[PDB]
DNA sequence: CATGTGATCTAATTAGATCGCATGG
DNA sequence: CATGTGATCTAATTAGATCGCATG
């Protein structure tokens, strides 16, 4: 009979600290949140929105085995490597082994470094996320280096946006059915500011590019405001992703800087569903 | 662990070869008897962990970049990542006390970016091996101690650079230099003769 | 006795609806709030941040005496006309009789239209704001047309910014000493986001242009963040002006569009100090 | 029958000569510089039955913008209006001598709550005036367009500066409200 | 037979440097 | 004499359109 301890997390390619946001939202106590990230806008968002709790370590390639043992142990290793060279939306993608695609192997490397030795059965959980719209050869290789097959979770089931994502990991009940919580805004209208009308129930996948906010190849505007068409506002994008309103209203970021952060990040209700069974393994409230 | 074995308790070495069958190298130094202990893998894109395990235990894991040529179906970093992946598949359970070695050899095909990926994933900088009578050269990564303690003719990677670029442009393996890296292993496993 | 009634306000050059915001912060019940404003950005802020409570009537010059009769009566008429052709900071200022400077006489005109006729002793209050840094002749002409002298209220006494403003009007106790509320943030440090250091106690007057965000003729940065110099973020500007954080995080506005709205507006604590005695004249929650 | 003498406050131009041509302790008050004239000044200058103001003609002697004369006109007019208990009639008078531009003209109509009547003279130039008296707006006059008056305004700048031949034709139908010296 | 954790074009905005001097401190 | 509810000019950065095609 041993009381559960607060969680120690290693988050690679942290972005805007969605992992720490979801863990706090679940009441899971966090002893350590070590994040490797290089974009200063993202680091500023994480530093501000979590009051210096996150500790940044820089480039994922600067993190050695020795660093993992000094800063460890870790109970949770999470990350989603860049996909601009993986996703088939980029006709100039350099693949899994070139460009930014090869940063995946840094995750596989640090995961191997952070795994408990054979014989140590302490609780250890990991999650790797990336896009479904990737090359078949690149998905096969990702699964073999991680030695697991992914589960496909589309954010459309618990939010107002399509976002089919692959998730490799060992978290409990990763493949259990998705639950539409009362905290989920399932339709675009529920994420819009006052005085604005949605033209679509669900919005298509939001990338970092403005053309993804408009719908279809005909570039249909998503919302109306007193009979004039308009794209989504930043606060509305955050609500579509499940972030607190004005989460990214930080550091004088432009609209497109804010969308670059959001377009690369996770759907918050999806991560909350994935992280939810973790609260039976670590200290809470 | 860099401890020596008494000669009478040296067992024949079990070698896993990837991207190269180094039979002729290892037979020529008395590591294998010429009977009917070395597994060569055709292509590693589908071998899982259970495969490396069912291929029996391994004492040495070898992988190498193909020499300058067109048998680059894959990008040069693919051979390194795949070598690292199956290397962990072939590591002994942390209880076993027998000697275990690995080595990855580069025929000057990786560029600077692939070289730092190399030294970070295998956790050591490459020892470059030159061939004088200034012909060829190779960089090697391995836990073999006498490849880190012995001192071959040092070469500037800029001298290697001139060669490397020139050799790549000029467009089999340097058997003499890969053979030399195996000799300090004779003190750990069984030796055979003619 | 006779119970007090909600206030009916005519707000000319309403901007980002500082008038309605301060009235609601004071708990004063507002029957109707009619706003004359032309800037679509300004109107969107007010529409959103007050759930369509504000009724917009457009250009101040299209508001006739007939409209005042239909829409009235009003208990409060407030306004601050554009000062780009009034403030000596513009060497190309066209004066009070040209450019946008003449829009002051529209306030004078509508103030006359809305005044109770002689004999009608219903409570009637009005306020006109503009900059101290105007010409002697132009200030003289404003006081003659409104038939009263202004009072000088510098926002530096209740906020983290210099803003010496003139206020014409008949509000109760416009000359009473200015007291620092405990919810006032007097120092710049209190307005900054986490992890940032203020280099100044009070900043200089914030206009619509970013050179006013840097201090002195030397244009010093006001903030250090991890030993790197930086300007104020928009949320920090909002805190300096006293608005709710993210008040202007609306309509995909740039940092510049947001600073234009704030640079033209009122210091919220100053208006709260000016509006506070109205609580004894109208219904409050 | 009981028609008291008129009390006329003139602004920016003394009308003495033209209104004495109709014979209207002088009854008139002429104001030097209105900029410092307050309400108590107009109030202590006795009651007023008609207030008059005018733009200067195309030419100098004006250090002000053409809009300054109206705003000041509109200001001191309401200073001079009587309380609703006053049964005596009250009228005002503001006439333009082609100096107002279009942008400046709409300010006139909105601030005075009516559009101007156009009055020409062909043998000179023309003028336009706003006023509540029922004898200009009701009685039909020579209707022209503001565009041919624009050609006469360019013809005004062409030639140069006086309007009084037509200005007198305006203050005429006021004698049926005050005294008359013939 | 639609679709996309992007990218490359443009023409439109924005950020920073600079200019400005009457004024009341 | 430091200051300013601005404005102009100029590289910088954003919108916005368009381009891609492997894959589920
Ligand atoms: N070399 C590197 N080291 C660490 N992070 C890197 C990196 N190269 C790119 N990144 C970061 O990896 C991130 C992948 S986008 C993933 C962000 C995260 N899923 C979220 O929810 O916010 C990007 O933010 C990018 O800035
Ligand atoms: N012709 C016009 N009619 C109505 N409003 C106008 C106008 N011309 C300019 N304005 C508006 O007048 C405002 C002056 S700045 C005053 C803003 C207000 N005091 C606030 O607290 O936000 C600006 O917002 C400008 O858009």
Residue numbers in the entry:
A (entry chain A), C (entry chain D): 628 to 912
B (entry chain B): 178 to 213, 217 to 313, 317 to 354, 358 to 380
D (entry chain C): 185 to 208, 215 to 313, 318 to 354, 358 to 379
List passages from the publication reporting this PDB structure.
Mammalian DNA methylation is established by de novo DNA methyltransferases DNMT3A and DNMT3B4, and subsequently subjected to maintenance by DNA methyltransferase DNMT1 in a replication-dependent manner.
To further investigate how the sequence context of DNA substrates affects DNMT3A-mediated DNA methylation, we set out to determine the crystal structure of DNMT3AWT–DNMT3L tetramer in complex with a CGA-containing DNA duplex. The resulting DNA duplex harbors two separate (ZpGpA) • (TpCpG) sites, mimic of two (CpGpA) • (TpCpG) sites (denoted herein as CGA DNA). The structure of the DNMT3AWT–CGA complex was refined to 2.40 Å resolution. By contrast, in the DNMT3AWT–CGA complex, although residues S881 and L883 retain the same fashion of DNA interactions, the other two residues, R882 and R887, are no longer within a distance for hydrogen bond formation with the DNA backbone, leading to a reduced buried surface area (289 Å2) in this region. However, in the DNMT3AWT–CGA complexes, R836 turns away from the CpG site to form a hydrogen bond with the +1A, as well as +2 or +3 flanking nucleotides.
